Structures are given as C-alpha cells and as structure tokens.
Write a protein that binds this ligand. Structure first.
Ligand SMILES: OC[C@H]1O[C@@H](O[C@H]2[C@H](O)[C@@H](O)[C@H](O)O[C@@H]2CO)[C@H](O)[C@@H](O)[C@H]1O
Ligand SMILES: OC[C@H]1O[C@@H](O[C@H]2[C@H](O)[C@@H](O)[C@H](O)O[C@@H]2CO)[C@H](O)[C@@H](O)[C@H]1O
Ligand SMILES: [Ca+2]
Ligand SMILES: [Ca+2]
Ligand SMILES: [Cl-]
Ligand SMILES: [Cl-]
Ligand SMILES: [Cl-]
Ligand SMILES: [Cl-]
Ligand code: NA
Ligand code: NA
Lengths: 231, 231
C-alpha cells in the first residue's frame, strides 16, 4: 500500500409439490477503488448503511447464477494493495470467469434446510464484510422474495474486517426439513479477501462447511409458502 | 495527512401539565484515532452498523448536558490530519470545556415542536456523519425514552462525508404545538468537522436555523405521553 427483527426462533417455510432446487442464487457486482492518489485508496461506500439494501445495485452487474452450493468458503491472497487483481471463486459458486477478487460485492440468497431439530450456531468471518439475515421476514418472506427482497431487517450476524466484530455467530433453534430464508451479503474493498460460513449443532461435534444438502432455492408463488409445522 | 419505520406522517407526543424544558439533551464521547502509522489513520468504527446503537457507549464518556438549543450548526477547521486537535462547540451546546473537535462522537435527543401545521423539510449535512431519527417509535416512544432509547429504527435522513449522500433531507407533515421525538447522532473521525441542521416549511420562504423555540425536553412518565391530537 413474519417480523423483520432477528430472533433465536426464526420462522421457516414449507414448499409444496415442486422439488426444491439445489443451491443458492448469487449476484456479483463491481466495487471500484477511488481515484488514484486518494487516501485511503479504497471506497468506504461498502459501509454506508443502505449499501447492502440499495447502494450495491448502482454498481456494474457482473453475473447472476443459480445452484451455488458445497463449501462456499474462500481465501483470496492479493499481492498488492490499492490494485484490482484477478482471481476465481471456488467451483461451488458456478462462476467460471475471472473477476476482480480484490474488490467486488456478492449477494447470495435462498433457503437453509436443517437436518437436525435443535440449536444451530453459525459462525462467520470475512475480509471485508459479510452480513447475514436469516428467517422469514428477517431475510425475506416465504416464496415471496419478489415482494420482500429489499426489506430485510437488522442483521442476525455480521463480520467486518478490522473492526471489533471481525468474526460473529448466530445461534438459532431450527426444525429439520423446514426451509429458512437466508441472505448473505459480502464485500471485498481492497487487497485480500475471505469468506467463512460454517455451523455446528448441539447434537454432534462435527463442523459443517459443505452445504450441498442444506442450501436450496424455492420458486416464488402468489400465496407464498409459509411454514406449516410450527404450532 | 408506534412503528419504528421512517414515515412522512410521524407520530408525536402530548405532554401533560409540566412545562417542557428548553433544549435537547446531549452526550459527548471520545473517538480515538488508530495507532500511529495505520492506513488510514482514522478508525472506521463510526460506520459499523451498530456504532450509533451500542458501539459508541464503549468509548470514554466526556459529558452529558441539558438545554442544548439555538443554532446548533458548526464548522470546525483543523490544521493537520490524523491528529487530535482541540476546539469548542458553539455556546448553544452549553459545554464550555475544550474537546478534541477533530475526533469525537455526539448524541442529541429530545423533541421538536413545530410552529406550522404542514410539510417541513429538514436539510442536513455533516463531516463526518449525522444520522437522524424522527417521530415516536422511529426515534423513541413518547415520554418513554427509558424503555426505548436503544431501539430507534431506520434513519429518516443521514449524511456521510465523502459518500454519495453527503447532504440529505427529510420531508414530514407535522402538527403545530405537538412534540416529536428526535435523535441526532454525530461523528467526526478526523480533521475538519461540520454539522448543519436546518428546516423550511411550505408556508414561508425563511430557512430556520435557530431552534430556541423548537427543541424541548420532556420528562419520562410511567404511562407515556402519546399524542392526543391525531384522529
Ligand atoms: O490484512 C487484510 C486487510 O488489508 C487491508 O489493507 C491494509 C493493509 O493490511 C495494511 O498493511 C496497510 O498498511 O493498510 C492497508 C489498507 O488499509 C485491506 O484494506 C483490508 O480490506 C484487508 O484485506
Ligand atoms: O475534507 C474533509 C475531510 O478530510 C478527510 O481527510 C482527508 C483529506 O481531506 C484528504 O485531503 C487527504 O488526502 O486524505 C484525508 C483522510 O482520508 C477527513 O478524513 C474527513 O473526515 C473530512 O474531514
Ligand atoms: Ca480486503
Ligand atoms: Ca472529519
Ligand atoms: Cl412468510
Ligand atoms: Cl488490492
Ligand atoms: Cl408513543
Ligand atoms: Cl486531525
Ligand atoms: Na446467469
Ligand atoms: Na452534566
């Protein structure tokens, strides 16, 4: 160089006849540096309170893909600060092309399906930013993302590199086989990048990092697909 | 180098027998630079999404004063970046002591009492940050700040120096003589500072910058003081 509030007992969704499709949807957007000579060289727009809501959409759209699943963690090691440098996302992201891994924004959305009924703790870390919404309402409404995408509530967990919250966790009680809306919003402002998203349950001692049997996409429907299990 | 959502028709409050006290309450907090040699030298904590909610309270408390009113605008011109430099707030702030005007955080809260029934447009600008909540619920509950202070909603207006939103405005319909909860959250991260808060009404052509007959403080009460005028 559902209510929008985060909760420990989130609401979930009950899909009907159509088989859920594997994986999350992802959108990729540009995130330019500031003009040469600026101090610092990186743009602080990523921290504007509405950047994850409306601001990101004013940047150049790079891609929109389906079927993102597996292990979505990555570490991108840059060689120079203040410089756009190319790299590739892991194959799990279904995006073959190079992108500026030093400086970009990424949105992932869809549903998390548990295998365990009970408490789950999701652990996150990021360079630079990962904001997580989770649950109907807090993320978006069941099979009604089209009317609720931009209306997510306060984050269930968030991580900001360099901050007092560089890693974070969310503990929620979930029901096996129910589909929970999830939104992951990521940014790299400069230099190295990293995303880590894993979970554990009170059940066993394994950390889950491969979401192949956990992330799904559901079609929106006129009436929605609110969870039919809770009572 | 009331609902928490922002609205155009905010809810207000009806004080009982006790005469409203002149002015807002203010709290002042430290905001340190990063360690010498850091790039950039200023701390980005001010932009953490919970900094205006919980994070500011972890910093050193400098002052808590009553009776802030008059013209609250200021421009502080620093002579060196990355350096704590002393200055004084305007006399309107009722705080005589020097403080590090280059790097500090300030919270103001109380009620705005209009003189006009009709649309008001408040205009703000700041170096570095000014976040405004306005209306019962969005700011805090009528004569119930003690149970609602930390639960303000999405900002009615906000300004961030260097951003695509360096000035902002809020247009709201208000009733004369009703008391609207208001919260102003300010930060200077480095170097120069500035705060501007003014309004106009559709009625006349004058810009109001002297809040002497507009800002008030109301005691909290067990039952609250919800507005009795709307119907
Ligand atoms: O360390 C990861 C972190 O790097 C920041 O760049 C820093 C750099 O680490 C530091 O050595 C230098 O002095 O200042 C740089 C810019 O603030 C990235 O900005 C940050 O996004 C992370 O990737
Ligand atoms: O201009 C007000 C603005 O100054 C920032 O400091 C800048 C400075 O303006 C710029 O000339 C220099 O190259 O980089 C500095 C640090 O980013 C303050 O950081 C900012 O808070 C405002 O006060
Ligand atoms: Ca980075
Ligand atoms: Ca400044
Ligand atoms: Cl729903
Ligand atoms: Cl870089
Ligand atoms: Cl109220
Ligand atoms: Cl300074
Ligand atoms: Na596509
Ligand atoms: Na005092």
């Amino acid at each position: 160089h559902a209510s929008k509030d985060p909760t420990t007992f989130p609401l979930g969704c009950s899909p009907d006849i159509t088989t859920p499709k594997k994986g999350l949807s992802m959108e990729l957007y540009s995130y330019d540096f500031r003009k040469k000579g600026s101090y610092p060289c990186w743009d602080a727009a990523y921290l504007d309170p509405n950047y994850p809501r409306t601001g990101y959409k004013s940047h150049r759209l790079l891609a929109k893909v389906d079927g993102v699943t597996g292990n979505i963690n990555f570490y991108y090691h840059a060689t120079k600060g203040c410089t756009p440098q190319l790299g590739h996302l892991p194959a799990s992201y279904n995006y073959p092309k190079p992108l500026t891994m030093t400086n970009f924004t990424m949105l992932l959305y869809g549903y998390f399906r548990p295998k365990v009924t009970g408490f789950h703790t999701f652990t996150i870390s990021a360079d630079d930013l990962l904001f997580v919404n989770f649950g109907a309402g807090n993320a978006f409404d069941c099979c009604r993302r089209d009317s609720s995408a931009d209306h997510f509530g306060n984050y269930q967990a968030y991580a900001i590199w360099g901050s007092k919250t560089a890693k974070d966790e969310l503990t929620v009680h979930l029901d096996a086989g129910v589909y929970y809306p999830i939104r992951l919003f990521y940014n790299n402002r400069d230099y190295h990048g990293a995303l880590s998203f894993t979970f554990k349950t009170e059940s066993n001692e394994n950390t889950v990092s491969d979401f192949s049997e956990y992330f799904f996409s559901l079609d929106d429907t006129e009436e929605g697909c609110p969870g039919l299990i809770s009572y």
